[PDB]
Design a protein around this motif. Structure first.
Motif, mmCIF file in Angstrom:
data_model
loop_
_atom_site.group_PDB
_atom_site.id
_atom_site.type_symbol
_atom_site.label_atom_id
_atom_site.label_comp_id
_atom_site.label_asym_id
_atom_site.label_seq_id
_atom_site.Cartn_x
_atom_site.Cartn_y
_atom_site.Cartn_z
ATOM 1 N N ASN A 1 0.940 -1.211 -0.056
ATOM 2 C CA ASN A 1 0.033 0.130 0.007
ATOM 3 C C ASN A 1 1.005 0.943 -0.055
ATOM 4 O OD1 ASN A 1 -2.002 1.317 0.146
ATOM 5 N ND2 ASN A 1 -2.408 1.255 2.136
ATOM 6 N N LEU A 2 0.825 2.216 -0.845
ATOM 7 C CA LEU A 2 1.907 3.339 -1.395
ATOM 8 C C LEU A 2 0.943 4.330 -0.005
ATOM 9 C CD1 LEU A 2 1.871 3.530 -5.161
ATOM 10 C CD2 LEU A 2 3.468 2.573 -3.038
ATOM 11 N N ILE A 3 -0.639 4.654 -0.070
ATOM 12 C CA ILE A 3 -0.462 4.973 1.138
ATOM 13 C C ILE A 3 -1.997 4.709 1.575
ATOM 14 C CG2 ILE A 3 -1.537 7.088 -0.224
ATOM 15 C CD1 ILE A 3 -0.048 8.726 1.974
ATOM 16 N N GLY A 4 -3.036 5.325 2.318
ATOM 17 C CA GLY A 4 -3.799 4.647 2.625
ATOM 18 C C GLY A 4 -4.148 3.701 3.740
ATOM 19 N N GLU A 5 -3.688 3.903 4.778
ATOM 20 C CA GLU A 5 -3.456 2.752 5.509
ATOM 21 C C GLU A 5 -4.683 2.655 6.770
ATOM 22 O OE1 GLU A 5 -2.522 0.322 5.683
ATOM 23 O OE2 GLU A 5 -0.691 0.803 5.473
ATOM 24 N N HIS A 6 -4.967 1.738 6.863
ATOM 25 C CA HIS A 6 -6.061 2.468 8.025
ATOM 26 C C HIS A 6 -7.368 2.783 7.571
ATOM 27 C CE1 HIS A 6 -4.737 -0.617 10.714
ATOM 28 N NE2 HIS A 6 -3.055 0.043 10.178
ATOM 29 N N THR A 7 -7.870 3.292 6.490
ATOM 30 C CA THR A 7 -9.059 3.944 6.001
ATOM 31 C C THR A 7 -9.499 2.813 5.531
ATOM 32 O OG1 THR A 7 -7.381 3.842 3.936
ATOM 33 C CG2 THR A 7 -7.678 6.042 5.683
ATOM 34 N N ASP A 8 -9.134 2.192 4.916
ATOM 35 C CA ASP A 8 -9.523 0.629 4.448
ATOM 36 C C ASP A 8 -11.048 0.119 5.128
ATOM 37 O OD1 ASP A 8 -7.863 -2.443 3.805
ATOM 38 O OD2 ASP A 8 -10.051 -1.817 2.875
ATOM 39 N N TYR A 9 -11.213 0.058 6.041
ATOM 40 C CA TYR A 9 -12.227 -0.258 6.829
ATOM 41 C C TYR A 9 -13.946 0.893 7.353
ATOM 42 C CZ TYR A 9 -9.829 0.243 10.894
ATOM 43 O OH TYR A 9 -8.685 0.835 11.379
ATOM 44 N N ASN A 10 -12.989 2.137 7.215
ATOM 45 C CA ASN A 10 -13.910 3.161 6.814
ATOM 46 C C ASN A 10 -13.986 3.886 6.004
ATOM 47 O OD1 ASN A 10 -13.332 4.246 9.647
ATOM 48 N ND2 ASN A 10 -11.045 3.922 9.917
ATOM 49 N N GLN A 11 -14.235 2.798 5.200
ATOM 50 C CA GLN A 11 -14.969 3.446 3.521
ATOM 51 C C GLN A 11 -14.458 4.255 3.501
ATOM 52 O OE1 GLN A 11 -19.666 2.242 3.116
ATOM 53 N NE2 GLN A 11 -17.419 0.913 4.007
ATOM 54 N N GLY A 12 -12.673 4.901 3.087
ATOM 55 C CA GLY A 12 -12.141 5.725 2.572
ATOM 56 C C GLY A 12 -11.513 5.071 1.639
ATOM 57 N N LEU A 13 -10.338 5.373 0.991
ATOM 58 C CA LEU A 13 -9.808 5.673 0.036
ATOM 59 C C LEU A 13 -8.239 5.179 0.092
ATOM 60 C CD1 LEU A 13 -10.050 9.158 -1.503
ATOM 61 C CD2 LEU A 13 -10.995 7.614 -2.341
#
Ligand code: QV2
Ligand code: GAL
Length: 386
Positions: free
Chosen positions: A37-49
């Motif tokens: 993952n280049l960027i966007g950690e722990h946005t996964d389960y938050n409906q993020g990018l």
């Protein structure tokens, strides 16, 4: 730097092991890659990018259907749980599969259990992998997606690509006891070479951001160290979203989170500040990468790491030492922890020419044994013809 075997070596190794285990030649073969993952950690389960890319490290599965109705598996990976072999009957309406020992087979059992198509025949299979198991490059997801793609050969599926990623994700929840997000399963299925994938985890829309610049390198540094706190972080985000009357932290921007600071816990506020800020950072990172502004991309990586270290508190001293060592090298654009955290790997974006000195400088300043991978954006899960 550590060599990355190619599909030809893995296929040949898997096929030689299948002949020396079942007597005949395998009839089907599939591969599914790991991811960084280049960027966007722990946005996964938050409906993020998220902005992951598929790696040249992959899991290859070779096999053949059986008329018996049993599943016979063997893996050749040295880090695999013992025993290297397992056999079980296919699940029925009366009796279903259940997670157990060895743990590496639970990923295969989960996908079989939750496979949406029928009739599913028995099969013999050999599993090989170049993904370091449990190293933070999502070896499990590569195995889940490889298993799913293999089962599609046994009996073709009808649903969407998103439905396939959620089946493998449902296997990880029940059979691995890990309430992960959708990214790892999604990028393994949907990766394209020379491209990162900007994945909107709310709409499952994907955007292909090209990364095929010969002057650009992605360096993976495995810390070689070691998720008790991952669940807890997930529910703190859901409590904050519930306290603000929102379905998820994706619906919250930093100004509203600051306006509702007294409605949520002090730690809960610090978790949401990362999540809301990280969602914004990946959108800026994708835009920076489209226009070739690697220095801006690298700065967003450093902000993401510091955010994970202070606000989300999912980094460790080894990861922080690896990032600070990489950040001292000019020609490194940015460096950052990847995966769930508490160890694993760090991702680094840097000039291709600076890769040899970066590894020497990082290794010299690290109080442990670091392993390196120089990886390019690879293709997703694919059927291999024998
Ligand atoms: O116990 C853990 C700790 C948490 C992470 C996790 C595991 C283990 C490693 C040992 C067995 C369970 N394995 C994975 N992934 C995985 N195992 C494979 C086996 C064969 C081919 C591809 C594979 O990918 N993930
Ligand atoms: O950003 C943290 C990530 O960590 C991974 O290990 C997990 O499987 C992903 O779903 C995502 O949550």
């Amino acid at each position: 730097a550590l060599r990355q075997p190619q599909v030809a070596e893995l296929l040949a190794e898997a096929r030689r092991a299948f002949r020396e285990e079942f007597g005949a030649e395998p009839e089907l073969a599939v591969s599914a890659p790991g991811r960084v993952n280049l960027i966007g950690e722990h946005t996964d389960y938050n409906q993020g990018l998220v902005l992951p890319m598929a790696l040249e490290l992959m899991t290859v599965l070779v096999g053949s259907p059986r008329k018996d109705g049993l599943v016979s598996l063997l893996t050749t990976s040295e880090g695999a749980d013992e025993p290297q072999r397992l056999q079980f009957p296919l699940p029925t309406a009366q009796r279903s599969l259940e997670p157990g020992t060895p743990r590496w087979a639970n990923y295969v059992k989960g996908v079989i259990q939750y496979y949406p198509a029928a009739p599913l025949p028995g099969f013999s299979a050999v599993v090989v992998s170049s993904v370091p198991l449990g190293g933070g490059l999502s070896s499990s997801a590569s195995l889940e997606v490889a298993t799913y793609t293999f089962l599609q050969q046994l009996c073709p599926d009808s649903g969407t690509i998103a439905a396939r990623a959620q089946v493998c994700q449902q296997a990880e929840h029940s059979f691995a006891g890990m309430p992960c997000g959708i990214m790892d399963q999604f990028i393994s299925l949907m990766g394209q070479k020379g491209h990162a994938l900007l994945i909107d985890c709310r709409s499952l829309e994907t955007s292909l951001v090209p990364l095929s610049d010969p002057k650009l390198a992605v360096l993976i540094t495995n810390s070689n160290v070691r998720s008790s706190e991952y669940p807890v972080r997930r529910r703190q985000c859901e409590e904050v979203a519930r306290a603000l009357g929102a379905a998820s932290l994706r619906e919250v921007q930093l100004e509203e989170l600051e306006a509702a600071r007294d409605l949520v816990s002090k730690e809960g506020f610090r978790r949401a500040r990362h999540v809301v800020g990280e969602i914004r950072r990946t959108a800026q990172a994708a835009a920076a990468l489209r226009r070739g502004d690697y220095r801006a991309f690298g700065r967003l990586m450093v902000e993401s790491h510091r955010s994970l270290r202070d606000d989300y508190e999912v980094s460790c001293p080894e990861l922080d030492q690896l990032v600070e060592a990489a950040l001292a090298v000019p020609g490194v654009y940015g460096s950052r922890m990847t995966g769930g955290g508490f160890g694993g790997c760090t991702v680094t974006l840097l000039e291709a020419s600076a890769a040899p000195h970066a590894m020497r400088h990082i290794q010299e300043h690290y109080g442990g044994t670091a392993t390196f991978y120089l990886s390019q954006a690879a293709d997703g899960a694919k059927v291999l013809c024998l």
